[model samples]
Target: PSLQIDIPDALSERDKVKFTVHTKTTLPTFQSPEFSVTRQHEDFVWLHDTLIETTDYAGLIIPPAPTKPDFDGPREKMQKLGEGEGSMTKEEFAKMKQELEAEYLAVFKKTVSSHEVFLQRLSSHPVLSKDRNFHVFLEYDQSNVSYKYSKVEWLMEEIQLP
Candidate 1:
């Protein structure tokens, strides 16, 4: 009765956010007692969708996937700063830009935490934890995923100002 899960680290490269799902388990079904895998938000989407669709789990409460991380607000604010007026020293622009960057970092942090809770909730379930998909998510350690696009600071690549 010992299976623990957590997201010890994450990387936010705009539209692509990488999640590291760390697992420690004593369950005999797992190939290793301890292993980790990198997953994307979409992976979590599939897991949630699969669990809910399983005819056998119709009676159980399945956790929904977390909302997409939104940095659009900060980006426009950051972008207008791109063609920004020279009303203040570029140094001031730098300060304001740093503020926008930090804003999204906070959002990404919370999103990661929420997904971890989603997994934790599922793992805590008697039936769901034993599901093969759940085990695959926890233990498989191979991911080099596709990058569809990015529209945030990622869009700009980097905002190196004067």
Candidate 2:
């Protein structure tokens, strides 16, 4: 069954309003199914007046005006942060460091003499000059005749990439 409440002109003089409603059912198994009311714009006044006048409907089913949020709580805090109050400020430090090790390893040539020269150059590098920590380890490929060049080859191989 459909009910049409005749809304009054005085109640709908403004734009929008909400109404509260209460209902009674004969069976406890009853469920209120959601439904939409479609009517022409002029009918809104009638609808509002009818719903308002109907005693079966509960008190003030809808609000006369929309409720607004107060900004004295979380909203205020959000505004303060947005306005840069107690916000994170950028600091510039520990941004740049030398890349001497990578640079030296990039151009390392595979030769016994160049190995000593590269090591010397690396040690004299301004960054490495202050605190030096260089170590040497050798591996032997006795079965290969090119074992003489193994040390340079192995060092360059290790320095290739991570």
Candidate 3:
């Protein structure tokens, strides 16, 4: 059960206020993804809260926010040795490089086999479609201003909006 911890009228910039909530064993329909998850194991219980936070995001944007700028910058330029200028940030390129190197050097043997896992876990989450199949261009790419083409069918499925 949830209780409202109210702020009295004396507080600044606010009138009488309360935060209200109630608890039930059943997951609220709005809380689950469109798929209507029913399982309530420990993992599902915790995932419920995370999904709620994402659903109630300030901008209603899914996945919180992009980790990089919507545009290409100096850092992305340096990381790519001037090759991958527009696709990622320096930090992003570094992380990808490290991941690539680790895979190449076999630092984490699981990295090579985890491609499908990554796809399903990160890119395949049901919420990626929250934006109604519209692409939001956030960062810059060195080669072009955006990554778009009719031939990008794989990504079409990957980011398919509802």
The most accurate candidate by TM-score is: 1
lDDT of 1 by residue, 70-139 (tens): 6677767877877765777969888988898888787878898898999998889888989998887776
Candidate number that wins on TM-score, 1 or 3: 1
Cα lDDT of model 2 by residue, 52-160, tens digit:
4656446533212112212233334434445543344442111111133233223222122222333243334443222211111011112122212257335422221
TM-scores for all candidates? 0.78, 0.16, 0.18
**Evaluation by lDDT, superior candidate among 1 and 2:** 1
The C-alpha stretches of model 1 lying farther than 4 A from their native spots are 85-87, 143-162
Native-to-model Cα distance after best TM-score fit, residue 123 in candidate 1, in Å: 1.1
List pairs with backbone clashes in candidate 3: 70-138, 70-139, 70-140, 71-139, 71-140, 72-140, 76-90, 85-142, 86-141, 86-142
Put down candidate 3 lDDT per residue, 91-161, tens digits, no spaces: 97678666655443441233222322321232334454232211111111121223444563444222222
Q: TM-score of model 3 relative to the true fold?
A: 0.18
Per-candidate Cα lDDT values, in order, are 0.79, 0.27, 0.29
> Which of 2 and 3 is ahead in lDDT?
3
Instruction: At residue 160, give the lDDT of candidate 1.
Output: 23
